[PDB]
């Protein structure tokens with residue numbers, strides 16, 4: 001029985017409204033829930049879904065240099081695999097094995113429909129329409145370390161923008177965009193931006209291209225034999241068109257706009 | 258001195274206009290020539306840019322079960338690493354090592370302006386306008402192993418159409434689209450499709466969205482010690498935004514069309 005570590009993140013892994021009457025992996029539904037099922041069938045193994053304790057994805061603490069989240073639960077032999085929207089990064093790659101990305105993404109711009117913004121350069125060229133990110137995370141860090149002119153300017157603006165353009169959560173960012181009457185833009189993951197875009201009141205949308213390129217990947221303990229079989233699974237699921245099917249399923253079929 | 262095998266596919270790898278007045282790797286230019294320079298810089302090693310002998314990307318022969326193109330040169334010990342627009346595929350993942358994707362792409366359609374086609378389905382619904390792909394390419398491998406209605410049908414057509422709708426090289430396919438008077442559509446990766454569309458004589462065009470989603474990856478023989486190093490360098494060059502830089506530098510459209 002393979003211990004699968006994941007995290008509650010809609011539409012990846014969520015609990016059904018009636019998860020009370022259900023039990024086991026049946027309580028959950030979502031993109032990663034179906035993917036986990038597909039990976040297990042192509043690899044031939046029984047799995048049990050568990051939610052990462054600290055609700056973190058994976059980061060090494062500067063102080064204790066200890067890994068937390070789903071990445072930590074892997075490097076310390078607590079879980080056999082990680083099936084969630086885990087982004088493939090250098091530091092992470094160094095401590096765990098990553099299969100080829102099962103979904104692409106990148107920092108994108110979320111504006112309230114009607115907002116006269118077309119790209120990142122447009123935002124950096126003005127201030128009448130405030131824009132921000134999470135007051136903590138990779139999105140924020142992305143600008144704090146960007147050598148690109150457009151992004152470097154955006155960082156200077158944001159860090160000195162008044163009132164504060166940083167939000168504490170994704171919910172706050174989305175709500176602020178919906179309440180600012182087109183006077184505020186939020187920078188978040190494309191997958192999450194295009195997901196909200198399919199949710200009523202349907203007043204938001206993604207604009208322009210992503211400011212960068214990332215990709216989620218299934219993770220296994222560095223050196224785990226299970227990693228190879230899972231990688232081929234991903235590639236096969238992608239080639240057969242299944243990954244595009246699961247995407248269209250939880251993002252558009254269940255759409256609302 | 259690491260031996261790097263690559264293919265002349267512009268804007269990835271091309272021979273400088275005055276290459277005869279040059280020598281060494283300095284003879285070439287392109288996205289992959291730069292990427293290679295960066296990979297070698299970080300991994301710390303000398304290299305030589307060799308061109309794939311049989312001028313193919315890679316494909317296994319059903320009967321002999323022998324690989325050709327770059328995949329072959331890596332499998333049979335002819336090259337230490339492959340730095341070119343090599344598509345990461347299941348069948349290739351099984352015989353060679355791949356680094357995480359350094360660039361994304363998807364099969365697309367190239368046509369001569371005025372061609373009554375604007376989607377893969379349109380082509381699959383007729384025969385007046387012939388269409389094929391590149392030999393020993395991942396695109397041809399796609400349709401052949403595809404079980405997705407439209408694609409499965411397109412494959413059947415292709416291997417039954419007369420004369421042969423297939424071509425030996427990308428240029429051979431592009432030239433056919435321009436000379437066929439619209440009586441031939443070419444299926445090639447969007448990356449190469451969009452580049453050529455912004456170039457003279459400005460007679461080709463990309464229609465409809467891509468048919469799939471994947472990405473090019475750095476390849477090395479299985480077990481190769483370069484694998485890890487190169488992979489981490491790829492993830493770093495991405496996080497540093499170096500990949501996007503090269504992407505914008507070589508795909509920069511100076512409005513010829």
Ligand SMILES: CN1CCc2c(-c3ccc(S(O)(O)N(C)C)cc3)cc3c(c2C1)NC(=O)/C3=N/O[C@@H](CCO)C(=O)O
Nearest residue numbers: 009056057058059069085086087134137138168169170171
């Ligand atoms: C599809 N999306 C959904 C949200 C999300 C969040 C995420 C979680 C909470 C929130 S919040 O509730 O609004 N908040 C700010 C508390 C916002 C974003 C964080 C991470 C992530 C994803 C995937 N993938 C990662 O690799 C990752 N690393 O995350 C890193 C930390 C940040 O870089 C890690 O956990 O190591």
Ligand SMILES: N[C@@H](CCC(=O)O)C(=O)O
Nearest residue numbers: 314343344394395396446
């Ligand atoms: N990228 C393909 C070649 C181009 C194509 O098939 O259109 C490969 O690596 O085989």
